[PDB]
Amino acid sequence: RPNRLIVDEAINEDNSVVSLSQPKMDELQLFRGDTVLLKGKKRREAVCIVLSDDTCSDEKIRMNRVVRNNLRVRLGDVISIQPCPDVKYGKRIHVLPIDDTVEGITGNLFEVYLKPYFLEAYRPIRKGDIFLVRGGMRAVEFKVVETDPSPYCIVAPDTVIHCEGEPIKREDEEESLNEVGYDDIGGCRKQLAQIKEMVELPLRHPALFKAIGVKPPRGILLYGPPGTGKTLIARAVANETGAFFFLINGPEIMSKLAGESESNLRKAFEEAAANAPAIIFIDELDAIAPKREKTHGEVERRIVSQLLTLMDGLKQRAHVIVMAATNRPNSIDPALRRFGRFDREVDIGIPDATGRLEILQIHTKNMKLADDVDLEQVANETHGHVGADLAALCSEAALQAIRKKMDLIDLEDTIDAEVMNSLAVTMDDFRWALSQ
Amino acid sequence: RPNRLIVDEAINEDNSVVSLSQPKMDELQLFRGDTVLLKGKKRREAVCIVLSDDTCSDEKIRMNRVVRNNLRVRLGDVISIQPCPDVKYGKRIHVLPIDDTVEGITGNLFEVYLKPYFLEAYRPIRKGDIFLVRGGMRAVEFKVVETDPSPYCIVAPDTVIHCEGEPIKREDEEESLNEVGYDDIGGCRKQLAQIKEMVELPLRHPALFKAIGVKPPRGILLYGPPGTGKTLIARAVANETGAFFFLINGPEIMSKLAGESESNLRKAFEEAAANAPAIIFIDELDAIAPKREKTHGEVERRIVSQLLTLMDGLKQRAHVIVMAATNRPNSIDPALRRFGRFDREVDIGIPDATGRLEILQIHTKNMKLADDVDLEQVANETHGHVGADLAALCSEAALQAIRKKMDLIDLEDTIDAEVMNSLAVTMDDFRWALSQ
Amino acid sequence: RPNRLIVDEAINEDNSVVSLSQPKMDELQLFRGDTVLLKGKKRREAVCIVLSDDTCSDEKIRMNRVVRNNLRVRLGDVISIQPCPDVKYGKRIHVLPIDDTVEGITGNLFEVYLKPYFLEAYRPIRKGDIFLVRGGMRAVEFKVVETDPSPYCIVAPDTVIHCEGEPIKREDEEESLNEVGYDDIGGCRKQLAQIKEMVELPLRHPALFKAIGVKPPR
Numbered sequence A, B: 001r002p003n004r005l006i007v008d009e010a011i012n013e014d015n016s017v018v019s020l021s022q023p024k025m026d027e028l029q030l031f032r033g034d035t036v037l038l039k040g041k042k043r044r045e046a047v048c049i050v051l052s053d054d055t056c057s058d059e060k061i062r063m064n065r066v067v068r069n070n071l072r073v074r075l076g077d078v079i080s081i082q083p084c085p086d087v088k089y090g091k092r093i094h095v096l097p098i099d100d101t102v103e104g105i106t107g108n109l110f111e112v113y114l115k116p117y118f119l120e121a122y123r124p125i126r127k128g129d130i131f132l133v134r135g136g137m138r139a140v141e142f143k144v145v146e147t148d149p150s151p152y153c154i155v156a157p158d159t160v161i162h163c164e165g166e167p168i169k170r171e172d173e174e175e176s177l178n179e180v181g182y183d184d185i186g187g188c189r190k191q192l193a194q195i196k197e198m199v200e201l202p203l204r205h206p207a208l209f210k211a212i213g214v215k216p217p218r219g220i221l222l223y224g225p226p227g228t229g230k231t232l233i234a235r236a237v238a239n240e241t242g243a244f245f246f247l248i249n250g251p252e253i254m255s256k257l258a259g260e261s262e263s264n265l266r267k268a269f270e271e272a273a274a275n276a277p278a279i280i281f282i283d284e285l286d287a288i289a290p291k292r293e294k295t296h297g298e299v300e301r302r303i304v305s306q307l308l309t310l311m312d313g314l315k316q317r318a319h320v321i322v323m324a325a326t327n328r329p330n331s332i333d334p335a336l337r338r339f340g341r342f343d344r345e346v347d348i349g350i351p352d353a354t355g356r357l358e359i360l361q362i363h364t365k366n367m368k369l370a371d372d373v374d375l376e377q378v379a380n381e382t383h384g385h386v387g388a389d390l391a392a393l394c395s396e397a398a399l400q401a402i403r404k405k406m407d408l409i410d411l412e413d414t415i416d417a418e419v420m421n422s423l424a425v426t427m428d429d430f431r432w433a434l435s436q
Numbered sequence C: 001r002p003n004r005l006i007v008d009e010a011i012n013e014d015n016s017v018v019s020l021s022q023p024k025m026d027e028l029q030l031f032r033g034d035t036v037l038l039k040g041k042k043r044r045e046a047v048c049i050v051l052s053d054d055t056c057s058d059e060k061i062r063m064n065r066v067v068r069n070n071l072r073v074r075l076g077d078v079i080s081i082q083p084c085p086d087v088k089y090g091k092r093i094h095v096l097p098i099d100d101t102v103e104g105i106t107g108n109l110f111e112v113y114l115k116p117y118f119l120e121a122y123r124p125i126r127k128g129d130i131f132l133v134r135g136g137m138r139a140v141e142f143k144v145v146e147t148d149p150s151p152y153c154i155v156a157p158d159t160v161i162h163c164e165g166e167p168i169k170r171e172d173e174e175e176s177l178n179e180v181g182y183d184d185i186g187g188c189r190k191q192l193a194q195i196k197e198m199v200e201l202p203l204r205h206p207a208l209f210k211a212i213g214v215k216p217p218r
Ligand SMILES: Nc1ncnc2c1ncn2[C@@H]1O[C@H](COP(=O)(O)OP(=O)(O)O)[C@@H](O)[C@H]1O
Pocket: A184, A185, A186, A187, A188, A225, A226, A227, A228, A229, A230, A231, A232, A233, A325, A359, A362, A386, A387, A388, A389, A391
């Protein structure tokens, strides 16, 4: 059908906007800025604004996770689109925050989140939507409980927005937007793309490997210096593909008594296989399986052997992918790179200046930046920096902003765990941080 | 006398401004902005504008080299000051460029240098003054041939400025401002101060060491990575103290036939001693006298020996100081760090961020910078950089400015060796250079 | 001022073709496939076929070295372009090989080089042009001695193409196309670009470094 499209990653960071190719909108007869009605899985719908995108495939639609969540679908799934000509300016909408996103937040909610979020934006909303509003170094989720023209409308300047009391509980299928996704990863476009390919069939179409006798990858080794976002990638790939995630921390395993280590490795692979499709992530692999000579222990050599055995003991394995992070290829036992094991490697390098910028935007999404803040500038003075450095930078900048305001606040009493929304991080804060 | 002051270095880079202490100006009854007549040696006079400096001491006057040259005086000499209440707005002045400063310059001298230099500035000038105007990546010197009033006047908006044809020859005592001076050295405050102490008496008061039997330093070893400005320091100290300068380049000596090396070392010390007070600078000392083991030759060992001999053969001498540069203490033969020889060592380190800024201003003095150019910014993104790096940076910036304008210029014909005065180096040029 | 362009490297490997930006041809009112007259240094002219190029800057013209040589200009120099509406199918042209390019060649020059080179191609040529024909693991240069409609024409199927023996000597300013050029360097795009930058001002505008005191790389 022409109205069926494949879900793809957003370029436009605004949660209300989905993107089509110029040709596709032509074909579907959709106006730039039109309100469209999206149909997903489990009888879910979403309403969004449609815009053209030059880079979008003709058969794909780009949407943010917020809308993917609302439609209960994942990247690569199929949605249907159709114009929404009947959509009315809403008389009144009722929204409530999800409890787990508003712990600690002692603000107005309406004045701090909702009012600025909706103001003059003409956002469409549908009853039962969860949307996200960022601010005050948090990101709060709200559920739309009622819209006056039901079940959807446009929040126009005259639309009354109600949020009368009592945060609501999170239902089971409602994944938190605080979960890691691809949108949380900057400057890895190329490698993240490879990893997604490798994993697509095994994790999203597992039934295939029962129907054919072709071998998908089993083990993927992510290498690169500390703080490059290897843990982040693995976690994200799991979340996005809806696979079960099992973390094995090198040091955590090695901290255990001889024997309770091997018992823990075993339990990890068993639990993965039980909950497949699944990803096992082995953080700090070199702690567990260092270069064959670097081990001096005898229990140490037994642990690495136990790991090789466990890798080999993964056949079709239902559909379990093992991902592991390490500093360098040569830091680990070469027997791990043997064929049935870690046979795929991906280099997560130091980010470039464009990547640095993406990372800086990711780690500032929930801050209020002054107008004088130039992230591209901060990008340019941080050549050596990896993701973890940049995140620390933004964190140091923000905490400096807070200290500057803290003497002022203590004196005219201590609003303290508030006023963090009116606070803005200035370029002076970043300079301060950049020289520390 | 209170009209008698010691010549010190300038903080204001205007070559028309001389700075005194509030108290002294009070004492001498001088108005901030007043024209003062300065008297020095060889019956040379100079008219300058007097301002105040918190750092200047009551006994000292701060002036730029331009004015020290005009007064035939050097740092530490004694000048006399007096108000100039009779000074008139000039009717007409006549100036000519010094030939050696205008080779290659195919501009309109008046339109490009003189007009902007004098315009609305109210500069005093005195017949027989040489002044310097910077611009178009050059610095041109002019001599004042005639002033209408008297021997001096103020160049007021109505003063007619003549420069009718024919660059003039440089007289003997007229030192080029293209010579290296302390104003060409950035970010060495502490060390430059030590070296100046060491040579003050030997080079400026040589008659003393005939009257007493105390030993001044003979050899000074400047240490630090390449491009830190060791050659520059030695050259500057020579020029400023009026001493004779003799360069010995390590590689140049070692490039000679066995025997012509030793003959060249000898000729260097002989010529120094003949023209004392003098500085001998040995650039790249480790090329001539490397660690005792690093030499393999037999003629090589003869050269090092020859050097030890020559230096130990310089007692108070005709007042000859020997300076030598090397990367590290340990790179050279320990016998050279002897007691009658290189017994004083001074570390010329990597410059800090303040130093980096001074260097960047030094290497931009003759460029036109756009308003968007922030040198302090360039200072901050060049931590590792040494002076030689920063000079290359400015050079790369300027050449990029020129290339951008070169396509445009070739097309609407090729002013070429001109229009370089209207050209301005932009922050975009520096960014381009900073990422290369 | 609109007809003056900056010489740039060829993308189209055919020595007859120069390339302009789409906008520029619009501006100059030139037909795709038109014969154009190029004016260079030392009162030299060339005639070429003009085609559009999407990647060519609006102020630049792309040409192969053959044409740069004929115009006595180099990359970055300035030429002028203008349409050539009067150009006629030539009755007869006379070409001779340059001696130094034909030592050892004991072939039929016409049958082996000229005939295939001109055949049904509609190449424009101007008296005093040197052109290059490749073949038999060698590349021969020819000089155009005479064209019937003088001084330029199109070599049409009916144009009689004469050699008439006796290779000619190479004049001084006539650089061999056997010389190395950027044309003979593959797979160095990025680095060749850097080196060209470094060297541009010092080598092509040397008069500058007498006028200013900035240091180019050495
Ligand atoms: N590419 C990146 N994009 C966004 N944030 C990043 C990136 N790399 C690192 N970070 C941030 O720094 C932290 C450190 O990264 P981490 O997942 O521990 O990487 P690694 O496992 O390679 O040490 C992350 O949790 C994240 O907040």
